[PDB]
Write a protein that binds this DNA or RNA. Structure first.
Ligand code: ATP
Ligand code: 5GP
Ligand code: MN
Length: 1095
DNA sequence: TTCAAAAGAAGCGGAGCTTC
C-alpha cells in the first residue's frame, strides 16, 4: 500500500484511479511504476524540470550545487554554458510542439470529450499518453514534470544518439528491406546505415525517457503499459523532432528498388550539429545533471567505468566471474592522446584527410553513378571518425594543460559471442583513425644504437605499420626490408614529416607526397609510422625516445585454426598436422616461431592452401566437361572477367591460372560458420561489379581529359601496354559480360547444364549510368556459384578437414533443434497465458503479459538447458528480442503513425549461429579473456578480438602470454559443452507438444531429405537423440586429442609477429619426425588413452 | 540460413485487416 500512495503523492493529479479492478478510467502509469528505494533521477518531484535543469546548467556553481558535486567537468565552461542555454530554449520549443499535438489529438474525433465520459482511450495503442495527462477544465493537459523530463531525454538523445547506433551491414539491410542480400543496389546499404529505422529510433529514445523518469517498473503490470507509455512518449518526441527538423524523416519505397516489394520503410536521421559547435566538447551535461549514475560520459583519470552485470543485450545471461574480471582489467587500462598525430590530423585538415584516406571531393560527373555512391559512404566513415576524434580531443583538452597526460578509460561489455567490445561507435578498438590518436601503449626506448633490442622492436612496429608482413619473416630479414623502404620510396614522405616535426607546417602538396610514397601501403597506422620515424630522426635524446608505436600480435587465420583445434574429433591425420602448423601449432620443434615456419618450412598459410585446393577442384571440374566446349568457354569467361578486375586472380600468357590467398579469406571463414555457397558467390560478384563500376569512372575521367581517346584505351589504358593490346581486353570484357549474363549453369541431377536467360546484357555502355542489375546480377551470380565457389568449398573442406565439417554440422543441428523447441514452447506458454487473460475483466487485449509472467515462462524452459556453460563463459544461442511473440503494436504517435511493434526478449531459432557463437566464443573470446586475467596478464594493451596491440617495451613477454592464452583456450571443448546441454534437453523435451511448424523445422536438421515429408513425432524424437550420441562421441575424441597433444612437445605461435612462441614442455619428444610418423605416435597415445577410460 | 542487435507504412477505429 505504501508504493501505491507513494507514487500517488508525486503524481496526485493524473487522470483515473490507480486500481486495475476500478470501474471508470484507470491510471496505468501509477499502476505500472513505483518510486525507487534509491534516487535514480534528480527531476523526480521537480515541478518544472526544464526550468530547473536550465537553471542548473546556467553556471558552474549552480551545476555543482544541483549535482551535489564539489567540482564539475572543466569542459563545462563559458562557451559551452551558452550553447546549453540555447539548447534549453529549444527544449521549450519541443515541449510546446508536444502540447499542441496533444490538443490536436484530444480534439480530433472528439477523443477528449469521449475520454472525459469514460471511454477507455488511455488503453488504445495511440492513447497511452492519456495516462500522463491531467484534467484542465473541459479538456486535458500533460503532467508538466513527466513531459518536461521526457523532453530533457529527447535533448540528450538528440545530442549523442547518433554516436551510439549499431553499424548495419548487407545482412541487416536485407532483413530490414526484405530484399535478397546478393541483389542489394549500390549504396542502399549506405543509405540505411546512415539512418535509424523507426524501431531503432524509438527504442533508444524510450530507454532514455524511462531512465530520466527515474521510476521502477511494477513486476505485476502489463508490458503494454510499462513498455508502452514510455514508447508512446518517445514516438511523440520523434514526431516533434520531425516538425522541428532536428530529425529528418525519409519513407523509403522498395517498390522502385524492386517492383514486387510492397514494403515502405521509414528512415530517421538526426540533423548534424556543426563540427565546431562548443556543445560537442561536452555533449553529456544533461545526462550528468539528471541521472545520479550517468551512463553517457567520458571517463578521465581515476574515474573507472562500472562493470556490466549482464551479457550485452542478453539480460538473461550474467557475465561470469571470469568475464567480469576481464572486463575490469580492460576498463582499468589508461589511454592517452598522442599529441603529434592529433596535430598532424589538424594540420592536414578534415578535407585533406578525406582526400588522403577517403574519396576526396566528388566530381559527380567524372564518376559512375554506383561508384559515386560507394565513395560517399567512404567519406562518411572517415569524416565521422575525424569529427568524433576532435570532439573527444576538445573535452580532453579542458581537463588539463597537457592533453597527453590525461588518462582516458573506456567502458567494455561482453557480447553474445564472448568478445570484449569497447562501447561506442568511434573508439580505439573500432576506428582506425582514432586508434592512432588515442593509445594505451607507450614505451621509453633506447634508440641511440640501431643494434639495440629496443631499436629492433621499433623496427618491427614500423614495418608492420608500413604493411610489411612481419610474421612471415625473421626479425633480421624484416629489418633489412624496412631499411630498404625507409631509404627508398618513403624518404620523400619521411623528409616532409621531419620538417613537420621541426616547424609544424606541411607543404600544400602533402597529400600528393604521402599518397605517392605509401602507394597501397597507405593507412592510418602507416601515417603513425611515418610520424614516429620522423620524430625519432629529430629526437634530442634518442636514448630515451617516448612513443606509443605498437606491434600487434595478430592471430594467423584465427577462427579456422581455432575451429580445427577445438572441434576436430577423430584420430590425427598427417594433413591436419601440416595444416594446423600453418596456424602456429608446431609439433616436435622446440622454440619454433611462425616467422621461421613461413620462411623455411611452408610459405603457404591456410588461405593459400585452400586456394591451391580450389585450383585442383577447378581442374577436376574441367575434366568432367572436357568435351563440352560451351561449358569450357563459360568457365574461361568467368575466370577472364575476374582476371580483368580482381587482383587476386591472374591469368597467364598461355591461359595459366594463378590465385592469391586473398579470394579465399572471407569464403573460408564464413563457410565454416555456416554460410551458404550462394551468399559467397554474391560477395565475389559484388567485388567484381565494384571494380567494374570504378573502371567506368576511369573512363568518364580519362575521356573528358581527352575526347579523342578510344573506348578500349579509356577503360583498359592504365591496365594495358599498347593500343590493340587494350582492344582485346575490351573484347574480352564485352564477350565475358554477354556470355555470363545470357547463359547460366543449372544443376540438373548431378550434372551441370547451360541454360539461356533471355535477359543477357545488350547495349552500348554509358560509363555514368552503367549498372549491372537484377537478372544480370543473378546470372553473374549463378556462374560464380557453380564454376568458382563450389570448387572453392571443396577445396575448403579438403583443407580444414571433413572431420571438422562433420563436427560443425552436428553442432549446428543440435543448437538449431534446441532453439526451435525453446522458441515454440515459449510462444505456446505465452498463448496459454493470454487465453487465461480473456477470463480477466481487468485485462484488455493489448496489455500483454507482466514481466513476472514472462519471467515464469522463461524459467519453465530451464529444464531444456537454454544456456551453454563452459565454466568461464555462458552462451545463450537462442536468445533474442523479437516481434513475433506478441505480434502486435506497442504504441503509435498521436497521428496514428510511427507504429512500434511490441518486442519481447525471447528465444528464437539459431539457424547456423551455433557454429560461430561457439567458435568465436571459445576460440578468440576465451584467449582474450584469458589474456586479461591470467597470471602476469599483459598491461597497457588494446585487444581487438584476435589481435593485441602491444607497447614496444613488452612485445616479447606479452606475445608469449598471448600464445599461452591460445594454448589455454585450446584446452576447451565446445562440443562437450553443447553436448552437456543437449543431453539435458533430450531428457526433458516432449516433441509431441510442438506445433507442426516446429516439427518440420526440426525435421530439416534431424532428418534426411526423404524421411522428412511425413515422418512421425517418434521419427523426429529418435533422430534428435541420434545427434546427441554423435555429439558425445565427438566430445570424447576432442578431449582425448587435447590430452594426447599435451603429452607431446609443442611450440605455439598462433599470435604471430614478434616471434615469441609458447612452449608447453611436453615430455614426449616428436622432433625429427615426419607428420606421418607424428600422427602414428599421437594415434598410439590416443588409443592407449582411449583404453585408460574404457577400463 | 555466416556471427557480433531488432527493424514496413498508414486509413479506419479503438484491433487488426487491408492495400500499397
Ligand atoms: N566476416 C566475418 N564473419 C565471421 N567471422 C569473422 C568475419 N571476419 C572475421 N571474423 C572472425 O574474426 C577472426 C579474425 O579475423 P581477421 O580479420 O584477423 O582474419 P583471420 O581470419 O585472423 O585471418 P588473417 O588474420 O590471417 O588475415 C576470424 O578468424 C574470424 O573468426
Ligand atoms: N565476427 C566478426 N568479426 C569481425 C568481422 N569483421 C571484423 N571482425 C573482427 O575485427 C577485426 C578487424 O579489426 P580492424 O579491421 O578494425 O583492424 C578482425 O580481425 C576480427 O577479429 C566480422 O564480420 N565478424
Ligand atoms: Mn588475425
Amino acid at each position: 500500500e505504501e508504493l501505491k500512495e507513494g507514487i500517488d503523492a508525486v503524481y496526485p493529479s493524473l487522470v483515473g484511479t490507480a486500481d486495475s479492478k476500478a470501474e471508470g478510467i484507470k491510471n496505468y502509469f501509477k499502476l505500472s511504476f513505483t518510486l525507487p528505494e534509491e534516487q535514480k533521477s534528480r527531476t523526480v518531484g521537480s515541478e518544472a524540470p526544464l526550468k530547473d535543469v536550465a537553471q542548473a546548467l546556467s553556471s558552474r556553481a549552480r551545476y555543482e550545487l544541483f549535482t551535489e558535486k564539489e567540482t564539475a567537468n572543466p569542459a563545462f565552461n563559458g562557451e559551452v554554458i551558452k550553447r546549453y542555454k540555447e539548447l534549453m530554449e529549444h527544449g521549450e520549443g519541443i515541449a510546446d510542439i508536444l502540447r499542441s499535438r496533444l490538443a490536436k489529438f484530444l480534439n480530433t474525433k472528439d477523443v477528449g470529450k469521449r475520454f472525459a465520459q469514460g471511454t477507455e482511450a488511455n488503453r488504445w495503442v495511440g492513447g497511452k499518453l492519456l495516462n500522463i495527462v491531467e484534467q484542465d477544465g473541459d479538456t486535458f493537459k500533460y503532467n508538466e514534470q513527466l513531459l518536461q523530463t521526457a523532453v530533457l531525454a529527447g535533448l540528450q538523445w538528440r545530442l549523442t544518439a547518433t554516436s551510439n547506433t549499431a553499424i548495419k551491414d548487407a545482412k541487416d539491410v536485407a532483413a530490414i528491406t526484405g530484399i535478397d542480400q546478393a541483389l542489394l543496389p549500390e549504396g542502399l546499404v549506405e543509405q540505411f546505415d546512415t539512418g535509424m529505422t523507426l524501431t531503432e529510433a524509438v527504442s533508444s529514445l524510450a530507454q532514455k525517457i524511462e531512465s530520466y523518469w527515474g521510476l521502477s517498473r511494477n513486476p505485476n503490470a502489463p508490458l503494454g503499459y510499462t513498455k508502452g507509455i514510455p514508447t508512446a512518449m518517445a514516438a511523440e518526441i520523434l514526431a516533434a523532432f520531425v516538425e522541428s527538423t532536428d530529425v529528418v524523416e525519409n519513407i523509403v519505397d522498395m517498390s522502385e528498388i524492386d517492383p514486387d516489394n510492397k514494403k515502405t520503410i521509414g528512415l530517421y536521421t538526426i540533423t548534424e550539429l556543426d563540427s565546431f559547435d562548443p556543445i560537442n566538447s561536452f555533449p553529456t551535461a544533461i545526462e550528468e545533471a539528471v541521472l545520479v549514475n550517468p551512463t553517457e560520459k567520458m571517463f578521465f583519470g581515476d574515474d573507472i567505468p562500472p562493470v556490466a552485470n549482464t551479457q550485452l543485450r542478453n539480460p538473461a545471461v550474467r557475465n561470469t566471474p571470469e568475464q567480469k574480471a576481464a572486463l575490469k582489467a580492460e576498463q582499468a587500462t589508461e589511454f592517452y592522446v598522442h599529441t603529434p598525430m592529433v596535430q598532424f590530423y589538424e594540420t592536414l585538415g578534415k578535407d585533406r584527410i578525406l582526400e588522403l584516406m577517403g574519396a576526396g571531393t566528388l566530381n559527380k560527373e567524372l564518376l559512375n553513378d554506383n561508384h559515386a555512391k560507394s565513395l560517399e559512404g567512404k567519406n562518411r566513415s572517415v569524416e565521422d571518425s575525424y569529427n568524433q576524434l576532435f570532439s573527444v580531443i576538445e573535452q580532453v583538452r579542458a581537463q588539463s594543460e597537457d592533453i597527453s597526460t590525461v588518462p582516458i578509460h573506456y567502458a567494455y561489455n561482453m557480447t553474445r559471442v564472448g568478445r570484449m567490445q569497447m562501447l561506442g561507435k568511434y573508439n580505439p578498438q573500432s576506428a582506425k583513425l582514432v586508434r592512432e590518436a588515442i593509445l594505451p601503449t607507450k614505451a621509453t626506448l633506447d634508440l641511440s644504437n640501431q643494434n639495440n633490442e629496443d631499436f629492433s622492436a621499433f623496427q618491427l612496429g614500423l614495418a608492420q605499420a608500413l604493411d610489411i608482413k612481419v610474421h612471415t619473416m625473421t626479425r633480421e630479414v624484416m629489418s633489412d626490408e624496412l631499411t630498404k623502404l625507409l631509404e627508398g620510396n618513403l624518404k620523400p614522405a619521411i623528409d616532409m614529416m621531419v620538417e613537420f616535426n621541426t616547424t609544424g607546417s606541411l607543404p600544400e602538396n602533402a597529400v600528393d607526397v604521402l599518397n605517392t610514397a605509401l602507394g597501397d601501403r597507405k593507412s592510418f597506422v602507416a601515417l603513425m609510422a611515418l610520424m614516429e620515424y620522423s620524430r625519432y630522426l629529430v629526437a634530442e635524446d634518442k636514448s630515451a625516445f617516448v612513443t606509443p608505436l605498437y606491434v600487434e600480435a595478430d592471430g594467423v587465420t584465427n577462427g579456422p585454426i581455432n575451429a580445427m583445434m577445438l572441434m576436430t574429433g577423430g584420430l590425427f591425420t598427417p594433413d591436419w598436422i601440416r595444416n594446423i602448423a600453418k596456424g602456429g601449432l608446431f609439433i616436435g620443434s622446440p622454440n619454433k616461431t611462425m616467422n621461421e615456419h613461413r620462411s623455411t618450412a611452408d610459405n603457404n598459410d591456410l588461405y593459400q592452401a585452400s586456394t591451391n585446393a580450389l585450383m585442383e577442384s577447378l581442374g577436376k571440374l574441367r575434366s568432367n566437361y572436357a568435351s563440352n566446349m560451351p561449358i569450357q568457354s563459360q568457365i574461361d569467361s568467368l575466370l577472364s572477367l575476374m582476371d580483368l578486375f580482381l587482383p587476386d586472380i591472374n591469368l597467364g600468357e598461355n591461359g595459366a591460372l594463378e590465385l592469391k590467398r586473398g579470394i579465399a579469406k572471407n569464403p573460408l571463414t564464413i563457410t565454416i560458420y555456416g554460410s551458404g555457397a550462394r551468399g559467397i558467390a554474391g560477395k565475389l560478384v559484388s567485388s567484381v561489379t565494384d571494380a567494374i563500376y570504378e573502371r567506368m569512372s576511369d573512363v568518364l575521367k580519362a575521356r573528358a581529359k581527352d575526347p579523342n581517346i578510344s573506348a578500349a584505351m579509356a577503360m583498359f589504358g592504365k591496365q594495358a601496354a599498347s593500343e590493340a593490346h587494350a582492344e582485346e581486353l575490351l573484347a574480352r570484357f564485352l564477350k565475358d559480360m554477354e556470355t555470363l549474363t545470357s547463359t547460366v549453369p543449372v544443376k540438373r541431377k548431378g550434372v551441370l547444364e547451360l541454360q539461356s536467360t533471355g535477359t543477357g546484357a545488350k547495349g552500348k555502355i554509358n560509363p555514368k549510368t552503367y549498372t549491372i542489375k537484377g537478372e544480370q546480377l543473378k546470372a553473374l551470380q549463378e556462374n560464380m556459384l557453380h564454376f568458382f565457389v563450389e570448387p572453392l568449398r571443396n577445396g575448403i573442406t579438403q583443407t580444414v578437414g571433413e572431420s571438422l565439417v562433420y563436427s560443425t554440422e552436428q553442432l549446428q543441428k543440435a543448437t538449431q533443434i534446441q532453439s526451435v523447441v525453446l522458441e515454440d514452447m515459449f510462444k505456446q506458454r505465452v498463448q496459454e497465458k493470454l487465453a487465461e487473460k480473456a477470463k480477466d475483466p481487468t485485462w484488455k487485449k493489448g496489455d500483454f503479459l507482466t514481466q513476472k509472467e514472462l519471467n515464469d515462462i522463461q524459467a519453465s524452459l530451464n529444464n531444456l538447458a537454454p544456456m551453454i556453460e563452459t565454466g568461464s563463459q555462458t552462451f545463450y544461442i537462442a536468445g533474442s528480442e523479437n516481434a513475433e511473440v506478441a505480434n502486435q503494436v506497442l504504441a503509435t504517435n498521436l497521428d496514428d503513425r510511427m507504429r512500434v511493434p511490441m518486442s519481447i526478449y525471447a528465444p528464437a531459432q539459431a539457424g547456423v549461429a551455433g557454429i560461430p557463437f561457439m567458435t568465436i566464443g571459445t576460440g578468440d573470446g576465451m584467449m582474450m579473456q584469458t589474456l586479461s586475467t591470467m597470471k602476469g596478464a599483459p598491461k597497457n594493451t588494446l585487444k581487438i578480438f584476435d589481435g593485441m596491440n602491444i607497447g614496444l617495451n613488452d612485445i616479447t613477454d606479452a606475445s608469449r602470454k598471448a600464445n599461452e592464452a591460445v594454448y589455454t583456450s585450446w584446452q576447451g571443448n565446445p562440443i562437450k559443452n553443447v553436448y552437456e546441454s543437449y543431453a539435458k534437453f533430450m531428457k526433458n523435451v516432449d516433441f509431441s507438444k510442438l506445433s507442426p511448424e516446429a516439427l518440420e523445422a526440426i525435421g530439416k536438421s534431424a532428418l534426411e531429405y526423404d524421411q522428412r515429408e511425413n515422418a512421425t513425432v517418434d521419427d523426429i524424437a529418435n533422430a534428435a537423440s541420434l545427434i546427441e550420441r554423435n555429439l558425445r562421441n565427438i566430445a570424447l575424441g576432442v578431449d582425448i586429442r587435447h590430452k594426447v597433444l599435451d603429452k607431446v612437445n609443442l611450440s605455439i605461435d598462433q599470435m604471430a609477429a614478434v616471434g615469441a612462441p609458447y612452449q608447453n614442455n611436453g615430455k614426449i619428444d616428436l622432433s625429427n619426425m615426419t607428420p606421418e610418423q607424428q600422427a602414428d605416435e599421437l594415434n598410439k597415445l590416443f588409443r592407449e588413452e582411449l583404453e585408460a577410460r574404457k577400463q
